[PDB]
């Protein structure tokens, strides 16, 4: 049952917020947004492999909220069955 | 960073200060000069901040301290579920909840007094109780004695924990300043760690045990023989004969189908009419519900990795036009300073015990409850008592803030100052609104009571005369009866039964709930509680903004928290000083819950409460009175106070006799407290003087020199005599009158 | 020992010590010879 | 020096002189700023040791009796999963020449003398060799290292006769070693409560069907 339409709306939430949070479009580890832009940049020290700063808390957190977003979408389900 | 850094050893363990009395303070460790050394002793007991002078040993003080008052609590528990245990009729209650008595207290026949084992049925005896215990367990699936006794065990072995603890962080490894300023990962822990996963892991025990044994006895089966809870977590097929969404197992929850274990996660509303509390399926619910946002609200502050807020940014972000720099400099004023937070946290948890009680007695959590007339009105009025009292505390604590820590040249704040700058408006306008609610909240009352003694009723203000009907309640309560329909399509029913619409739920000839009506009777009373609580705020607030400074004394800060005067100069200075603020609001914190608890009481059993007919038609405890006589001075005298408490008077020679001896005891100690309000201090000096002569005369003249009590703590002994005279007079009036009429 | 010793003696400690004795010893009595309104022994 | 995961905090200490090290520590935890009880660096490499050890002994006998029982010498009686054995009644047991609770207690005393014994040394080095108990006192002195405390009760014939690097390196094996038997314990639990088949079967379950794949199916049963 890969593949059903609850499967594909969470690989593209998940994978958009690492996307988010690694290109450039979401405050990660190293980016602080502001009260108005996000490009607030700073250093924090959690030394790990990933050249653009992206850590194990962030491999986390864009994951978690990756959920967040894709349990919202998928139990909107008013349009896709009730039942899977 | 957040780390841990502690200190070894502190304060060596030894016996030497406990026979070094007033060793803490170095005034009291000289030794006994009077009698005033004695009582000295203990008022500055727990004052730590008097005691030393840096934050970082306070600090540990309170924190070691709060473990020795976790503790005692423990042992209260255990005592509870112990006594439940060994002395009750809990297992013969669990047969016939809804005509047994609940008794958990049995006394030693010494000088007669077995006459208190009262006949609570259920072939036992004993003192019937009333803090509803029983439907807790129950709630819970207990369903033995055996389990009463282990947890009690358990709860006592955690108050030897808990002690313990206190112990090893005092005197061993003591934290240090930087560990407790950090109050970001404070608050992390609390919301995610204690709140979030508290009510998950109980959301978990309810699912797995309270549910289903639950429902086996709500349908109707002797407690002996319901299998053991851990019988359901380990043969999976038990779960399936009541739960099919059970055979799964956990991986709907894994595939957002989660609209299979509707079986057991619903969102009913109203209440179970076979035991008159609510659905099960929705408590188990709600806890689930409450866990995910605590959980995910524990993940905001920053606290070691790049992720999460700053709570002094937050704080510095908010500031107005007309407030100026707002709330900068907030975050230090409340960090280097206890009596902040103690006053503030003392306001929340103040007021959330005041709405827990207006919430448990309309939406009746646990099963066979709503039908135990004896809980009902205890369970009100006593977290009405408890939140009345912790917001009192608020304002002492605040009161000491402005005198001790408070400082403009380092701890500056904006808004804290322009509080101050036009606080002469501030008590001046609530003045103005104290006196008009007083005069159209009371005098209402007494016009009403004037027509009605000169033959005119039909210039009474009532449903049957000019009438004042509140309307905007009664819209609001229009609108919860027809939520169901359209603005909470998923719910059954309205959230709560006292809702302008429905239908009552009887349970075992004894109404449960039924829609409370809201005439004039009612709307004259709600200006009245609108009225003390604006009194009492008055004082409470004055005495706040005013701590420092006033333009009769302009160096009162320089007094202290707690000074009796500043002579009788000037006119008269007697209580200036903000402890005697709050001396006076103790009396409207008083007065004000007073009325509310009559208020309940009333309204519950002439409109609520009562037996219903095997026909139907519903008889209310006294008859449905409330709304023509509750708006009479007098009236609340006749049907009220006299005619209700006939079963407190005559409750001599049977088991409620012991709330006949304390309905007179409180009188006493009530009238006592005058001899120490009204009198001075100065006059009782004097008589101790001639009885200290005839001392002498025989030698026995004592070395700790005989004094009068302080001025200051005259009154105190003054006010806290009346609040326990009156508030134990209306314990023996409530518990007796309710017990004996259901 | 001598400071515990010395805190048992301070005045609390004895007060209820010594009333708890005391307590003790007249619902005893009361326990033997209950009712008790009159002294009927000379 | 291979790091995994490393951090600003874990490198400021975890220097690499310590064996089995690898830069591995996100929690403040071996942080020797902060130093109570139990938190010192020296005592949790101290717990790192042992637990592992009791790993290693505790991990093989959590396999072998049951396949042993696959093709061993062993009567099938005393051929059972790890949690029949008797430890977890709930699961089963079986009727040694005891009954339990009197293997509890005695195997509690005699435990208590080594462990003890064993803690001692921690807090005074050399002490548990000057007491009297009955001889032995001349090798239970330890070598000043709690966790290594050599002597020829402890190292008989003596490995890491004489050369650091070895000592460092076969240090450096016993550690990783270790923490490969706690996350494989770690394993033949959460597979026995999901599974419920007992560990080794658990493998099969995986070889003679790849695509058991239980994690997808995910069914409780004891
Ligand atoms: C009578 C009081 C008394 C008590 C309660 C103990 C109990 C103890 N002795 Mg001890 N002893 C006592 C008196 C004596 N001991 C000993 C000789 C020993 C030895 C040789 C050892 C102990 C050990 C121990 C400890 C471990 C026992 C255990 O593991 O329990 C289950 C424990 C503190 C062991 C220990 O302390 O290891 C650190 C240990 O090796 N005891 C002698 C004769 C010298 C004693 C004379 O009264
Ligand atoms: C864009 C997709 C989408 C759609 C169509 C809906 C639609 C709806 N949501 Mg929903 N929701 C969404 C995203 C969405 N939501 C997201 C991203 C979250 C955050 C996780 C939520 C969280 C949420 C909650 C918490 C609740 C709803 C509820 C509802 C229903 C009212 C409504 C039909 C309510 C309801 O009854 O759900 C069935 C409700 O209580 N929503
Ligand atoms: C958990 C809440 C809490 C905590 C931690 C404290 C803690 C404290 N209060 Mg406080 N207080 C509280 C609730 C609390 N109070 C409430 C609810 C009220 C309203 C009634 C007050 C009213 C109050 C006043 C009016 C004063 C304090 C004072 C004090 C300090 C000394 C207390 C002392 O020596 O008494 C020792 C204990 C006793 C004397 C026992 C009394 C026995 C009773 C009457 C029975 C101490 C820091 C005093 C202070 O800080 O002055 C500088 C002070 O003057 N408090
Ligand atoms: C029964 C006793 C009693 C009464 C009537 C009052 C009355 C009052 N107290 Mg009070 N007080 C009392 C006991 C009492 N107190 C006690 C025991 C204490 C100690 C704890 C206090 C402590 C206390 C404090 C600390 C404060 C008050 C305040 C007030 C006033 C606010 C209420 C208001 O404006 O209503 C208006 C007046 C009434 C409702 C009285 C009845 C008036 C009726 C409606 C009509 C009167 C007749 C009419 C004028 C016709 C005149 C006839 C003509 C021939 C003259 C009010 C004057 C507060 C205050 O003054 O600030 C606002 C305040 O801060 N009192
Ligand atoms: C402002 C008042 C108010 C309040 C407190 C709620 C409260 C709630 N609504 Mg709601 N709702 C309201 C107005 C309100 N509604 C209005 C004006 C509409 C437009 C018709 C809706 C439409 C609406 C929908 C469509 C749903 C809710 C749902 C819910 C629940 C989540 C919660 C009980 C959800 C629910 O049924 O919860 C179970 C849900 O699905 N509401
Ligand atoms: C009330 C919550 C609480 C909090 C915040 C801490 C906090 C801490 N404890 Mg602690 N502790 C607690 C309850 C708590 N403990 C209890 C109830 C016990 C008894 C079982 C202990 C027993 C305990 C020990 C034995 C040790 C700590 C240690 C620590 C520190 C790591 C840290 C300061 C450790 C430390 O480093 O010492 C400070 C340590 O050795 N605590
Ligand atoms: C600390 C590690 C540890 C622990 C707690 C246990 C625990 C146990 N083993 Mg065991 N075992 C272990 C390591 C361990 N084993 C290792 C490393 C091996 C391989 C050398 C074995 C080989 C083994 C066999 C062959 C048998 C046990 C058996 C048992 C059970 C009875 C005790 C026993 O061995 O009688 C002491 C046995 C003597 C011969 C003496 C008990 C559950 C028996 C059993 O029924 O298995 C559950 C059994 O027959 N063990
Ligand atoms: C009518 C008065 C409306 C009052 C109102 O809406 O206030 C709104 C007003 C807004 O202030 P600011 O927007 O400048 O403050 C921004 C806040 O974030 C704090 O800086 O608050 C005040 O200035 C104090 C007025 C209290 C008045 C209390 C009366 C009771
Ligand atoms: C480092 C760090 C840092 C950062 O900062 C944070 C974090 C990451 C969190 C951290 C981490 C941590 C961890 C992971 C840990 C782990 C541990 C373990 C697992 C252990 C085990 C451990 C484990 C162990 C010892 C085990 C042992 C076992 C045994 C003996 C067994 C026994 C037995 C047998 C045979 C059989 C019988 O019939 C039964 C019994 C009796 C049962
Ligand atoms: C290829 C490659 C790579 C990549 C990798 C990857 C792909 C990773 C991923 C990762 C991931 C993939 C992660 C994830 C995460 C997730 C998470 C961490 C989650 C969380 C969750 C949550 C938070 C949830 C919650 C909840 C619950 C539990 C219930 C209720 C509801 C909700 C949903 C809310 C690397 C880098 C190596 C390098 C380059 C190459
Ligand atoms: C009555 C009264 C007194 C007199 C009360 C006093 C002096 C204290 C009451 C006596 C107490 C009970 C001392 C007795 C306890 C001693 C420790 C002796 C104990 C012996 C017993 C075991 C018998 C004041 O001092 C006073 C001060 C300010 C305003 C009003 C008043 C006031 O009204
Ligand atoms: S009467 Fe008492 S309180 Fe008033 S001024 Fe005199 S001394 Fe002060």
Redesign the pocket.
Known sequence: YIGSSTNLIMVTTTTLMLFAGRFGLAPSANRKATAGLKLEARESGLQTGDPAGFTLADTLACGAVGHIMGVGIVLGLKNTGVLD | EVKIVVDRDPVKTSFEEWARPGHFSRTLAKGPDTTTWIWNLHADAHDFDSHTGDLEEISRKVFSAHFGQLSIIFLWLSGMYFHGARFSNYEAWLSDPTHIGPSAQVVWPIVGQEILNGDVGGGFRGIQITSGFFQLWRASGITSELQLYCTAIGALVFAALMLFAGWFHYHKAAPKLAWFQDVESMLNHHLAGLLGLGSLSWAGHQIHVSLPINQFLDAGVDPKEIPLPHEFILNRDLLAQLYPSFAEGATPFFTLNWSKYAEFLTFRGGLDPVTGGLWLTDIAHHHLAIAILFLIAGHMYRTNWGIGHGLKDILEA??????????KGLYEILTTSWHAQLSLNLAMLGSTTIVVAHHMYSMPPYPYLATDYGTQLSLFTHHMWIGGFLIVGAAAHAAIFMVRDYDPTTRYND?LDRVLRHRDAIIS?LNWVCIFLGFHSFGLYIHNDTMSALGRPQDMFSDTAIQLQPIFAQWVQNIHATAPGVTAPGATTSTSLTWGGGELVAVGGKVALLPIPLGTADFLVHHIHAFTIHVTVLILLKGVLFARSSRLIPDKANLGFRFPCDGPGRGGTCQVSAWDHVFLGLFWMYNAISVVIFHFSWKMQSDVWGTISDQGVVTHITGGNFAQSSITINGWLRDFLWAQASQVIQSYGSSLSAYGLFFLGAHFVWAFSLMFLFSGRGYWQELIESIVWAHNKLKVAPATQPRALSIIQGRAVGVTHYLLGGIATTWAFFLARIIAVG | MRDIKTYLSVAPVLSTLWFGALAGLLIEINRLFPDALSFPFF | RQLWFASKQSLTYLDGTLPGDFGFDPLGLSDPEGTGGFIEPRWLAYGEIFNGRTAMMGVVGMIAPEALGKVGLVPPETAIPWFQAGAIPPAGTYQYWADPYTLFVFEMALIGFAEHRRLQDWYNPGSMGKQYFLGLEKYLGGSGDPAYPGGPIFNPLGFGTKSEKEMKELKLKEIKNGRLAMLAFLGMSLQAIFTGVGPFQNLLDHLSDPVNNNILTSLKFH
Do not use: C, I, R, V
């Not at chain 2, 908010?318 to 709330?327: A, L, Y």
């Open positions: 908010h500031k107005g036009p007309f407030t100026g720099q707002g709330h808004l306008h």
